[PDB]
């Protein structure tokens, strides 16, 4: 009954199949951007904790599947059968008949083009100047600057070179296996053990490669799901613990702008239940940042309510409010340095979630500088202080480049 | 092949989607020459059988 393609990748992650119970937009009408909230049901066998991740096995969207079948002149529904004899991280159903469109849900279609991929294309190219160009891309410098820097794909090069005689079955076999995407669970199991939420910023823009419009695979897959759709996922627990202190009076500082708020929504929901069970709660500061309350102030109502019930103290920073300076969380943190550092001196835990490439480092630098200024010590002493804080388990990161 | 009209009458009667993948099993022989122990959509299962023979006892 009822069974879906068991995917190797789904088996490797213990991903089970399950239903979407809610799916909705979090940004405001007329925002140029999208952030999604999805609620997912979990089977009896699965369970989770605050700071756990949802592993999502995504599907490739229609647009990009059609670009491939168009390039090869194939019908989506055309049944075919592969074979090699050779191993295959590309985790393809070999010696089975399977349509083109379903084969195309096993592979990554927009990873940068690899050197093996480029050689394969060069070898099937009967356009001499076009072969010279593909080979040019193999050189160390060109490969870094034109392939890796712009995320130029095999697919975009096949579209650029319609007389490259590569064939579908060689294409499919040269591609990497489809990878899971991780999302920070944004709910607490203390509210419903068998239901989990995620908070998904939708990747979208002009392709850095120059070939039209770019859409991030999992994020746009997730964005298009609706109540009653199924989804293949698993629970993943990160090596770096990202949980609330054992004692609910231990003070917390949380920094989580944008989708970085995600895991802190779980923290907030946990504290709220602990209160409802008579536990007393200490201070908890949430530094949240976004463009505008007219645009991307995710979970505003919930977070304002939480604050009203004494579950958190909320500090916002807005980058794009007319007639205000551009403000980021680290600017607010810096105003609050004295207080934040006293809290850490009394045993606070500090947490950062969200963007790991620019926001996290700048937040870290501001924390260390607040320390240095408050305790009149050097930057080296401030760095050692932070190192010790992390080694005590009191300085945790759930950040990503994505 | 069985035509769309008659395939839809079956999926409608059972409340099923054409594309719903499923897997059968028995242990017992089967002139009905069904792919058993394989996952296969409803609509394709329905191309293996006669849908308008008189009802048997």
């Amino acid at each position: 009954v009822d069974s879906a393609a068991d995917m190797p990748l789904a088996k490797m992650h213990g991903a089970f199949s399950t239903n979407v119970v809610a799916s909705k937009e979090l940004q405001q009408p007329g925002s140029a951007r999208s952030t999604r909230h999805l609620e997912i049901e979990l089977p009896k066998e699965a369970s989770y904790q605050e700071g756990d991740h949802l592993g999502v096995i995504p599907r490739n969207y229609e647009g990009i599947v059609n670009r491939v079948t168009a390039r090869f002149g194939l019908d989506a529904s055309q049944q075919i059968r592969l074979e090699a004899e050779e191993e295959k991280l590309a985790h393809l159903p070999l010696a089975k008949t399977v349509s083109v469109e379903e084969l195309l849900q096993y592979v990554e279609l927009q990873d940068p083009v690899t050197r093996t991929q480029l050689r394969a294309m060069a070898a099937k190219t009967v356009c001499p100047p076009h072969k010279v160009e593909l080979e040019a891309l193999l050189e160390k410098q060109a490969y870094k600057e034109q392939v890796l820097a712009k995320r130029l794909t095999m697919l975009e090069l096949l579209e650029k070179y319609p007389a490259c005689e590569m064939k579908f079955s060689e294409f499919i076999a040269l591609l990497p296996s489809i990878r899971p995407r991780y999302y920070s669970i944004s709910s607490s199991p203390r509210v419903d053990e068998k239901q989990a939420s995620i908070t998904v910023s939708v990747v979208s823009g002009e392709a850095w490669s120059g070939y039209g419009e770019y859409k991030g695979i999992a994020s746009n897959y997730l964005a298009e799901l609706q109540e009653g759709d199924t989804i293949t996922c698993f629970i993943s627990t990160p090596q770096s613990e990202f949980t609330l202190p054992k004692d609910p009076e231990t003070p917390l500082i949380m920094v989580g702008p944008g989708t970085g708020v995600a895991p802190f929504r779980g923290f907030v929901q946990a504290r709220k239940q602990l209160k409802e069970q008579g536990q007393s709660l200490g201070e908890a500061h949430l530094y949240f940042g976004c463009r505008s309350p007219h645009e991307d102030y995710l979970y505003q109502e919930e977070l304002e309510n939480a604050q009203s019930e004494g579950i958190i103290t909320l500090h916002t920073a807005f980058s794009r409010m007319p007639n205000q300076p551009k403000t980021y969380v680290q600017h607010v943190m810096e105003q609050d340095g004295k207080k934040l550092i006293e809290l850490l001196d009394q045993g606070a835990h500090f947490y950062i979630c969200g963007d790991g490439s620019q926001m996290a480092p700048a937040v870290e630098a501001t924390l260390m500088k607040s320390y240095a200024d408050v305790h009149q010590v050097s930057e080296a002493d401030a760095r050692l202080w932070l190192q010790q804080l992390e080694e005590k388990g009191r300085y945790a990161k759930d950040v990503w480049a994505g | 092949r069985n035509y769309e009209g008659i395939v839809n009458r079956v999926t409608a009667r059972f409340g099923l989607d054409a594309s719903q993948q499923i897997r059968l099993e028995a242990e017992e022989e089967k002139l009905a020459h069904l792919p058993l122990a394989k996952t296969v959509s409803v609509e394709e299962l329905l191309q293996y059988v006669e849908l308008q023979d008189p009802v048997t006892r």
């Binding site: 075919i80 059968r81 592969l82 074979e83 090699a84 050779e86 079955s169 | -």
Partner: protein, 229 residues
């Protein structure tokens, strides 16, 4: 009797070739019942076919690949010698030795694969001279030396995970690196052959394109794909 005999003889005939190697002369033993006595044969399996791992390998012949190890219990040393064995298959002229025996004598030509463990944050006994030479001594710059580093570690060692390979890798670079292939790590506590495999395949290619890659080991992966129906 007939079902059994038919089944058995059928299987024997499917699975083997038979030889009457003694040119056996029928001698019929009587025990009221009858049976051949002394009848012997040899049976050559048809492996219903199996013969099948041998490489047309000619080895190590022919850019210079020096592989150095830092090892106390041989994990890193066997990995090193394995690499030198696959290099020979890829036409290189590989050389295997400990790390702290080429201390200062890094090859100014070809490439040098460096395979090493860590012990509580420290180099193995046969690698200490190398690292010390590397740490303080920097004067005798490491320019020209095109290398790559593979790390043997255990996640069970908290704060020291892969500290020596990391040290060597990044130190080698803050001294003039021709890092042709990004470092690789092995966690003994999980999937050491996965990572070792990832780093390796990526590795040969990095050095391939860079120059190499041509003294055996079909440039052709000679790997097929399937694409059947």
């Amino acid at each position: 009797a007939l079902h059994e005999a038919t089944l058995v003889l059928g299987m024997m005939l499917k699975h083997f070739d038979f030889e009457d190697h003694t040119n056996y002369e029928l001698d019929i033993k009587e025990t009221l019942t009858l049976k051949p006595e002394g009848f012997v044969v040899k049976a050559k399996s048809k492996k219903i076919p199996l013969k099948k791992v041998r490489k047309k390998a000619e080895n190590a012949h022919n850019t210079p690949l020096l592989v150095l190890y830092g090892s106390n219990m041989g994990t890193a040393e066997g990995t090193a010698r394995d690499l030198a064995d696959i290099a020979m298959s890829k036409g290189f002229a590989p050389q295997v030795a400990t790390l702290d025996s080429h201390a200062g004598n890094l090859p100014r030509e070809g490439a040098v694969l460096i395979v090493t463990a860590s012990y509580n944050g420290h180099p193995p006994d046969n690698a200490k001279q190398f690292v010390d030479w590397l740490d303080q001594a920097s004067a005798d710059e490491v320019k020209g030396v095109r290398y790559s580093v593979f790390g043997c570690g255990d996640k069970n060692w908290a704060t020291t995970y892969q500290k020596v390979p990391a040290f060597i890798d990044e130190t080698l670079a803050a001294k003039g690196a021709e890092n042709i292939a990004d470092r690789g790590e092995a966690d003994a506590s999980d999937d050491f052959e996965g990572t070792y495999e990832e780093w390796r395949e990526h590795m040969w290619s990095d050095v391939a394109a860079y120059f190499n890659l041509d003294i055996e080991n079909s440039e052709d992966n000679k790997s097929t794909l399937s694409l059947q129906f």
